């Protein structure tokens, strides 16, 4: 769950991420909160070697989510801090721009 980790390393000012957050709805909050115990737990499924299919398919079972939906998302944090994951999932939809 959110908590206040300390901050340490910063290239980029990671408090003007979070101010966005700090303004953002309370629904905007639910969703994040949603999505951040699937990309976590499907994380410890793959070190466990098991196959992706079975892997994504367990958790689209246990968690009513498109399996589709949650790889995208997993790949997409990939490139983002792993802790500033529930602020990243702030934003809608992936972005269409790469750059």
Known sequence: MIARPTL?????????????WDNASDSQRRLAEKWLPAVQAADEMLNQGISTKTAFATVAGHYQVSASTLRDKYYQVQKFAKPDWA????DGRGASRRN
Do not use: I, N, Q
């Open 8 to 20: 340490e390393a910063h290239d980029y000012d990671r408090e003007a991420l979070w101010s966005k």
């Open 87 to 90: 602020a990243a999932l702030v």
